[PDB]
Design a protein around this ligand. Structure first.
Ligand SMILES: [Cl-]
Ligand SMILES: [Cl-]
Lengths: 168, 180, 161, 178
């Protein structure tokens, strides 16, 4: 090309068929932090974290930046927008989630407690029984069950939803 | 060891004996006085209106004897038939019974926009009731209906309950606002 | 101490004896009693008040006798009683499940709804339009499964306003 | 006017000036960086619901692209909307109210389907709280009382918007003392 736009990027990455690969680290302590926390390993950056870092303006995907880069990553790897928005929100709060084993979930650990977050979206109904069974399964794995409801405009609301035999 | 009599009329049982009406309300907060919306303790004349669900429960517990207006006996199984034949009352009965058997007082959730208001000892005694919404596990909801429940409980405790019932069995989801 | 005694016909209630003449004359004056015939809901109300005897039956036992005897809805009865307590003088309306009363020169039409008896939203809209097109304010009285009554005005319009 | 990208069941407007514009001019969309902005002071992006996106596209205000850059037509957004039972219903009410000059926002904070304003949030004293129904929906009568409860602290008044076959009518409901 002419000139590559690197200024204002803390790292640069490429999108490949199944992942984001970090090609340049312009701020060493930035990438070392992503490595320390577990999201970056040998150039491979977790998909949701790559989308998040792009949304912050710290990760450049080639010459694509900001939320435009975030979208490239979400669309490119087939991430759910609402799961990404909850993920970003949790990261903004200082939490460090991972993709959970159960479909549609994020898990993060805070204060020696593990939280399992089920991401629900307006316009996509679910069975009350499925909510009970999911909550039971989370509790059975020693996770606090949190539901994150994203409305049709992107407003996020969190509740703890605990399955029990008797009110208490 | 309270005993009361009632007349089945519409989908309700009316207890017109004042002393029986007062007893039922005093000893467990059953029923609704028709002359006073929220009594002070026992000071009302009645009659006490029992819901069909309450009447089935009390009959089955041996506390209440129900007659038709013609004076014939309405058995527990006749009340059960009435309750089971109404999809809403059938569902509510199963939760109603489970909470009462567990020692809660269970009242209408009308004023709170819910199916039940559930107390450990009674209205005006608990700081706040548990606000309980009834579901079958087969019911589908939009996720924003969980937020609607939260809005309803926001002034109360933001800590509400979904009672989930099928096959006579009940379990509960205790839901509260959360800040990650 | 009943002020009058009545009996149950197949289709109405007939006052057979007025113990307090003044009482019956007043029921006639306000229109509920005519030629011996007392309107069913008013008979139930007067019984519930302890004022009308049905044979030797008194009070709510007598009210229940009227309601069951004539196949009245208990909830419509309770709503009628409540309106009477407030000082209104309703009659049974033309549309099923309704009462109608006039106050301050305006006519109110009350649709009585009960917990455990669903309706279609379209039915509520159609009822409200019909009341409005008869120049009645449309009021809905919802009676919950314990007998708690709540009233709302419910007005059908093509645009919010 | 504005350009957005379709992603999930939403459209994101990432250009800051377009994002501030759509929000400032009629209160469309939801900024992702702040919940209740003071006027236009947010960075965005602006998330548009699918219903808003269809409305704006059909009014000729919004051009929608997919992430790969290919155009998304009004008929495509219409298909997405009509294929979701909730969004189909809501869209018909949404459109009717916007066409009649109202601002229409999510009713999430009020426990309803819509919060409807004559000028906008923080400007009207209180929104109309609007519950969406088909006339074929069956409800228990106490559901009306539940709606009364939701509106008890805002204004004791509330609206059912009743829609079928694209048409809408409304029931204006308020607490009454006989
Ligand atoms: Cl009950
Ligand atoms: Cl919307």
């Amino acid at each position: 090309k002419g000139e590559g736009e690197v200024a204002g990027c803390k790292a640069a990455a490429r999108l490949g068929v199944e992942g984001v690969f970090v090609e340049e680290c312009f701020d060493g302590s930035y990438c070392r932090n992503l490595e320390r926390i577990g999201y970056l390993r040998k150039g491979r950056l977790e998909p949701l974290e790559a989308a998040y870092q792009a949304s912050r303006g710290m990760l450049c995907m080639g010459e694509t930046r900001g939320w435009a880069a975030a979208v490239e990553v979400i669309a490119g790897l087939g991430l759910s927008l609402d799961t990404a928005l909850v993920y970003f929100d949790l990261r903004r709060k200082g939490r460090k989630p991972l993709v959970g084993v159960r479909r549609g979930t994020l898990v993060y650990e805070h204060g020696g407690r593990v939280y399992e977050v089920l991401v629900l979206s307006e316009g996509y109904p679910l069975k009350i029984g499925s909510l009970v069974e999911w909550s039971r399964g989370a509790s059975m794995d020693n996770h606090s069950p949190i539901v994150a409801i994203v409305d049709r405009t992107g407003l996020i609301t969190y509740y703890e939803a605990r399955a029990v035999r008797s009110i208490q | 060891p309270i005993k009361a009599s009632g007349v089945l009329i519409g989908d309700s049982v009316l207890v017109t004996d004042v002393e029986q009406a007062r007893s039922l309300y005093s000893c467990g907060y059953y029923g609704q006085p028709l002359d006073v919306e929220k009594p002070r303790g026992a000071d009302f004349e009645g009659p006490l209106r029992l819901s069909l669900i309450e009447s089935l429960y009390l009959a089955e517990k041996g506390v209440l004897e129900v007659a038709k207006p013609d004076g014939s006996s309405v058995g527990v199984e006749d009340l059960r038939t009435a309750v089971r034949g109404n999809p809403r009352f059938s569902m509510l009965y199963n939760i109603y019974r489970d909470l009462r058997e567990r020692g809660f007082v269970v009242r209408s959730g009308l004023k709170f926009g819910s199916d039940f208001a559930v107390y450990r000892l009674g209205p005006g005694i608990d700081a706040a009731p548990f606000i309980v919404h009834a579901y079958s596990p087969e019911d589908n909801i939009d996720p924003v209906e969980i937020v609607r429940a939260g809005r309803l409980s926001h002034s109360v405790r933001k800590k509400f309950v979904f009672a989930v019932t099928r096959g006579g069995d009940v379990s509960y989801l205790m839901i509260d606002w959360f800040r990650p």
